[PDB]
Design a protein around this ligand. Structure first.
Ligand SMILES: Nc1ncnc2c1ncn2[C@@H]1O[C@H](COP(=O)(O)OP(=O)(O)O)[C@@H](O)[C@H]1O
Ligand SMILES: Nc1ncnc2c1ncn2[C@@H]1O[C@H](COP(=O)(O)OP(=O)(O)O)[C@@H](O)[C@H]1O
Lengths: 153, 92, 43, 49, 43
């Protein structure tokens, strides 16, 4: 149990620090995301080189040898598909994440737009009671007010 | 070994999503509402406190009576017309 | 992950199907109303 | 100028693009309306006080 | 290297496909408008 107003600043103090930490990691997933993106492209090219051998595999006029290379690439081909699909799901998966962050930050600012506004009104009334309470009256007639206290004396 | 790498490809991916929602609950839970109307949210807590003193000050000093303001403004209106009588008096 | 996913949703009710339906339709009416501006300004 | 090309299709995207801002414009435009008279009440207190 | 690459991008949203598309088209219209100046000044 603390002052409701004072904890607000501390609350918003940790508010942004936690928010930024998220922003740091979001790029982290994207970086590795492209890392595999390149990785897939590397393997298919290797198949293309294997395919390039296949294209010239018959330059000798022999169809037999081409068979081994065509069977050789297939191991990669399945690996190509295996990894190719893997990034497909992640593609829209992160995109959903971005909507959260952009949507979320816009919310924060609207809060701060009022953060100080309430405080001023708080001080506006804090004095207001303080002023007139101290200035309750000058002719109280009961000696409770400071002025009448002197008057009776 | 080929198996191991596929694991790491997702190792960090789950962590980011974990942090993605960890804040998400943290943010909106802290930002549950601004007009809660129940004093549970931090904003409304302040709102009620503002009004708490508002009437507190009013009790310490009775405000003008409707008749008092009504005669006061009417007295001004009579003053307005009386000044308006001066308007006619000085102009004509 | 899913544990908190719905946890957050409960703390804040999501848009009603009618709300989004009118919201997008209102945009569509705005689209057509802006489309009326399209015709209004072009012709 | 979206129709300067004579194409009405492209103008549609831009007209749909702004609407996001348009609601944001109204969202913030109203926000300051209440505060406008809200502070004014405050000033009367201070000068009166 | 890639870690910061996207880090910078998030801190500043890049151009929208429509923005670049209108931007280049606006240039193309400027190109044609300048091309209109080409015809205007040459003929
Ligand atoms: N218009 C007025 N003319 C003369 N006295 C007034 C007037 N209004 C209030 N008072 C006096 O102010 C007093 C109230 O002052 P306060 O100290 O707040 O309460 P208390 O009188 O119980 O000490 C009343 O007792 C009353 O006699
Ligand atoms: N659209 C709305 N307009 C006004 N008040 C709302 C709206 N949505 C929610 N609220 C208020 O927010 C409160 C819920 O805030 P919360 O603190 O999470 O629960 P509780 O009200 O039990 O404290 C509700 O009591 C309700 O009055």
């Amino acid at each position: 149990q603390e002052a409701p107003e004072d904890l607000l600043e501390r609350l918003l103090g940790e508010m942004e620090l936690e928010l930024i930490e998220l922003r740091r990691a979001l790029a982290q997933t994207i970086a590795t995301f492209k890392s595999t993106e390149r990785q897939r492209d590397a393997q298919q090219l290797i198949a293309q080189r294997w395919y390039e051998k296949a294209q010239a595999a018959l330059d000798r006029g022999n169809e037999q040898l081409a068979r081994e290379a065509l069977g050789q690439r297939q191991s990669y081909q399945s690996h190509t598909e295996a990894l190719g699909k893997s990034l497909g799901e992640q593609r829209a998966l992160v995109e959903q994440v971005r909507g959260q962050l952009q949507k979320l930050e816009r919310k924060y600012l609207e809060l701060k737009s009022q953060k100080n506004l309430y405080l001023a009104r708080l001080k506006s009334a804090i004095a207001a009671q303080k002023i007139e309470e101290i200035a309750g009256n000058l002719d109280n007639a009961s000696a409770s007010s400071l002025f009448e206290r002197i008057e009776t004396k | 070994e080929r198996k191991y790498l596929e694991l790491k490809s997702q190792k960090n991916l789950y962590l980011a999503r974990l942090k993605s929602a960890i804040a998400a609950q943290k943010i909106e839970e802290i930002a549950g509402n601004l007009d809660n109307a129940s004093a549970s949210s931090l904003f409304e807590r302040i709102e009620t406190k503002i009004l708490e003193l508002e009437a507190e000050r009013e009790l310490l000093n009775p405000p003008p009576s409707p008749l008092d303001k009504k005669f006061e403004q009417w007295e001004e209106q009579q003053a307005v017309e009386a000044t308006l009588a001066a308007m006619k008096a000085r102009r004509s």
